[PDB]
């Protein structure tokens, strides 16, 4: 029962903390990179007009 409980909380943390923290992390990472390159090419069009 003690080893069952160690594994149980091991499993629980992964589903409720580690994996969700990553899933939300990946969302924010990919979000930033796209708008950054989206806004980066935007000024390059403005600089091309100079």
């Amino acid at each position: 029962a003690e080893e069952i409980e160690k594994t149980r909380r091991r499993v629980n943390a992964l589903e409720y903390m580690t994996i969700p923290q990553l899933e939300e992390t990946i969302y924010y990472i990919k979000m930033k990179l796209e708008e950054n390159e989206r806004a980066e090419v935007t000024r390059l069009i403005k600089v091309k007009n100079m």
Partner: protein, 452 residues
């Protein structure tokens, strides 16, 4: 007819040496082969005027071409004969019926409702769906959207509402303006076949815009429907319902034209003025003081990545009062329609509930059903994480109630029109499972009167 074409760059076009060209003026270009393409003045400066042709600028000879300025923005010919007809994105006849004789010509942009002349939503409009009519009541003049996803049966629910919507204790004063925005041909004939067989075409005004139609015709399609909707509601006094889908395809067509004109992209590539542009469409709904009829809008949009923080569903939630969520867990279970009432909300349902707008028990039953589901789902979750032995005897009852709630109350069928009476009666029958001591949100009065 001016023939001074100066430049033709992509979808844009410049016309020099003009006099009196106004902003947002609809133009008419006559090419070297006699073919006619319509455009729109995006900007006018000095004797120059930059326009964008709807169909594009492919195969245009700037030398021998001529442009005619109509002197008016994009308009719509409105009349009483639009009921039962089908128009395209630009309001042109598609059913090949008789020629329409317009009574007046209105700007597709229209005019803003004066906030002092605006009337608050009143009474209620039957949606024939238990999850709407009771838990998330639709009110005359309310902006209540339906959030869906690619694969979810939001087309069936849209057709279900468009043939089951009506006004109680009122006769022959209700119409449905169905506007399709950038859909496939097979999805278009879905509604075409359903509207005619169910007879709902006889009381509906339909505007169809396909996916292969010009992207400017996609962003001008909902404006055509609302202009005809405001004509039937404010000048003819009809309770007009406006169903629109898809709004995502409108957002894509709006970002396509924005990239075509090289505007500064906002969040997720979409135009920064997306909230403003969406608001010019959703704020058309509402009631007017001393004016019979009402304009009610039911937006239907698919959430990309099933994400609610996306600019399309998020910014829509900032305009519309509430939303109707369609989840995947309920759709896989066979619930028709798969409406999750936990994330859904109707902010004007108070002006729809109560006696004479609904059954006196409406407000009391609604709130007790909600709390019983929320606790029931919560108990159903406890049975998977911690097993069935960690829940008390009262917990298994709420978990059993949530099963019947999703399978009998919500799951009614896309072709099953309930009434407000049958909906409330079905809800009262479900409350008898829970003890009278657990119905802590309904007063002893309505309990002794309706509980079986």
């Amino acid at each position: 007819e001016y023939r001074t074409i100066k430049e033709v760059v992509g979808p844009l076009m410049a016309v020099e040496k003009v006099s009196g060209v106004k902003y947002e003026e609809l133009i008419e270009v006559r090419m070297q082969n006699g073919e006619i393409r319509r455009g729109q003045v995006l900007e006018v400066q000095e004797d120059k005027a930059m326009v964008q042709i709807f169909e594009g600028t492919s195969g245009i000879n700037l030398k021998n071409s001529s442009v005619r300025f109509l002197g008016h923005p994009l308009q719509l010919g409105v009349s009483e004969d639009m009921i039962g007809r089908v128009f395209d994105g630009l309001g042109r006849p598609k059913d090949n019926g008789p020629e329409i004789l317009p009574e007046k010509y209105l700007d597709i942009n229209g005019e803003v409702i004066n906030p002092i002349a605006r009337d608050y939503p009143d009474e209620f409009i039957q949606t024939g769906i238990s999850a709407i009519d009771h838990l998330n009541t639709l009110v005359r003049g309310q902006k209540l959207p339906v959030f869906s996803g690619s694969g979810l049966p939001h087309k069936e629910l849209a057709a279900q509402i468009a043939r089951q919507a009506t006004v109680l204790d009122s006769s022959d004063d209700f119409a449905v303006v169905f506007a399709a925005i950038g859909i496939t041909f097979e999805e278009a004939e879905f509604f075409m076949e359903d509207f005619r067989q169910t007879g709902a075409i006889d009381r509906s005004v339909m505007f169809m815009n396909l996916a292969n139609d010009p992207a400017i015709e996609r962003i001008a399609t909902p404006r055509m429907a609302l202009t005809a909707a405001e004509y039937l509601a404010y000048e003819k006094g009809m309770h007009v319902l406006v169903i629109m889908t898809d709004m995502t395809n409108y957002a894509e067509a709006l970002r396509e034209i924005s990239a075509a004109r090289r505007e500064v992209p906002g969040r997720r590539g979409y135009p920064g003025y997306l909230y403003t542009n969406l608001a010019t469409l959703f704020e058309r709904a509402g009631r007017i003081r001393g004016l019979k009829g009402s304009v009610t809008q039911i937006p239907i949009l698919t959430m990309p990545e099933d994400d609610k923080t996306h600019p399309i569903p998020d910014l829509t939630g900032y305009i519309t009062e509430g939303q109707i969520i369609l989840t995947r867990e309920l759709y896989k279970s066979g619930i028709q329609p798969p409406i999750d009432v936990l994330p859904s909300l109707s902010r004007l349902k108070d002006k729809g509930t109560g006696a004479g707008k609904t059954r006196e028990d409406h407000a009391a039953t609604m709130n007790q059903l909600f709390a019983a589901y929320a606790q029931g789902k919560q108990a159903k979750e406890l049975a998977v994480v911690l097993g069935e032995s960690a829940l008390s005897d009262i917990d298994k009852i709420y978990a059993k109630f949530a099963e019947r709630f999703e399978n009998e109350y919500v799951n009614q069928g896309f072709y099953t029109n309930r009434t407000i009476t049958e909906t409330l009666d079905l809800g009262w029958e479900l409350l008898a499972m829970l003890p009278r001591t657990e119905l802590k949100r309904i007063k002893d009065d309505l309990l002794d009167k309706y509980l079986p």
